[PDB]
C-alpha cells in the first residue's frame, strides 16, 4: 500500500498558453500503508 503520490502539476490551462509539455509522470510523495483494494475505476478531484 504505497499509494505513492505521483503528481505532475500541469496547471489549469489558463486563458491561452500554459504549454503542453513533458508527458510521463514522476514521483513526488511516498507513503506505504497497505489498505485493501481489489478493483476500481476512474475518479475526479476537488478544490
Amino acid at each position: 500500500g504505497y499509494f505513492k503520490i505521483y503528481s505532475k502539476h500541469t496547471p489549469i490551462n489558463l486563458v491561452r498558453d500554459l504549454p503542453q509539455g513533458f508527458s510521463a509522470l514522476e514521483p513526488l510523495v511516498d507513503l506505504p500503508i497497505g489498505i485493501n483494494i481489489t478493483r476500481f475505476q476512474t475518479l475526479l478531484a476537488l478544490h
Binding site: 507513503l31 500503508i33 489498505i35 485493501n36 483494494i37 481489489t38 478493483r39 478531484a45 476537488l46
Partner: protein, 43 residues
C-alpha cells in the same frame, strides 16, 4: 468533489477512512465524521 472514497466495495456504512492532508500531516482516521454525502461547512 466533496468526499474521499476508496476501498474494495466503496460504500461506507461503517467506520470510513478520514484522510486529511494539508502537505504537512496526513491523518488516518478509520472512523467516520458527521458529513456523509457532500460535506459543507461555512469557513
Amino acid at each position: 468533489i466533496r468526499g474521499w472514497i476508496f476501498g474494495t466495495t466503496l460504500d461506507s456504512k461503517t467506520q470510513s477512512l478520514l484522510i486529511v492532508n494539508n502537505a504537512t500531516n496526513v491523518v488516518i482516521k478509520v472512523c467516520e465524521f458527521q458529513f456523509c454525502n457532500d460535506p459543507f461547512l461555512g469557513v
